[PDB]
Symmetry: C6
Subunit: 95 residues, 6 copies
């Protein structure tokens, strides 16, 4: 609900990205704040939550999406982003 | 009509994606909720329905579209997406 | 004028796509309803008409555009798309 | 001024496309009606004019742009596009 | 706060770009002014600050993001951009 | 200020493009009128000025940006574009 850690998975294609998003949100209490079409085929899903939650989420999403479609590019956690980085992070996705 | 399972096919190009969409919707009672241009040439079609419907649909779409154009990237089902994932799923496509 | 069959050609680049569109529309009575920039360099042109018209059109467009530029990716006909698929098909192109 | 033939050059990148556009418009009396970013790096420039004008233009643009940057993909003329194809052709570019 | 030097990192994918942005902003007093989706999968993050700040920032971001996802494309500093270049530089990002 | 020659550099990525823009504007009296994301990763920067200015600018930008990131695709000058080509040239960039 109120944690500020950031979890991020980037995939080749939207399908593995949606699998990642589902596995992450089912794995721990994290909020899905963005899904971004990057260009070139990259898609990135972003979650916010407490450190431990985001840790468990990212690990789960990564294990899940590497088997789907063109797969996984990156799985990363930043437990406390600098206040400046909030300027580039999505507050809610657009669907 | 009211099922919440999710079916997804991602293709290289729009043509196999439209074949996928037609085969899926003809294969079982599923609703076509989105067609997404991902970037890089990826296109993803998304269907919602009951679990068994989405199962049959995805299987049909996958068999159909792998023979068309540049073909199939991914075919996947999530029978119950986390409530958070609804935030990134299209409610209706844009044409 | 009133036929609901669907003809589709996908090309690498816009130029072969315009050649495809011209050959298809000159080959039989079909309506050009969409030209779509897919991402990655894919372009897809879509025609509607009666079954026989769309058959002749797609065959003509395919023979024509494979010799132009980066060429042909896919040529496909769906003689009756499921009512659900109409949700993703363009009603008129944008130029 | 009033001719309806269509000249088209597709290039890898915008720079050779601008060279193409300049060579075509300097080579014969043709009107520059569109420059289109296709995705994947393809750019297409479109000219309208009388048949002979468009013939000379396309030949000139093609010779000119193949030496610039990533070069030429396609050079093509359609002397009379079907009335349906007008629906997908740009009336004026956007800059 | 008031320095006009420019720091820039370009990455393959958004995830390494967000890592870059975090490392740069944590490394020295710089302002994150832009994150740009370039097409093809390139993402570029831009920081402004005093010369020494931007120097330290870019070095930190570069060391950080080369280990994340598809990695680093470019890391560059322009300590005083020409007044003309301000016309193409983002004033604040969009998230 | 009032010259109509055109200088153009196309790069793989935005970073070398910004280096190009800075080197060109510092090298001679030219105005930066556009920076264009082309798709596929191509970026093109456009300068206007007198012939000699644009000559010196393009040469400087080219030497500068080939060492940055994924580098240089094309460097080109058109000393007097046809009046028709003005229709596709940017009047000012968007940042």
């Amino acid at each position: 609900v109120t944690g500020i850690a950031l979890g991020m998975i980037e995939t080749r294609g939207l399908v593995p990205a949606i699998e990642a998003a589902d596995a992450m949100t089912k794995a721990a209490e994290v909020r899905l704040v963005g899904r971004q079409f990057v260009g070139g085929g990259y898609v990135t899903v972003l979650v916010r939550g407490e450190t431990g939650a985001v840790n468990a989420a990212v690990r789960a999403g990564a294990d899940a999406c590497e088997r789907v479609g063109d797969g996984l590019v990156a799985a990363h956690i930043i437990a406390r982003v600098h206040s400046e980085v909030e300027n580039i992070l999505p507050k809610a996705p657009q669907a």
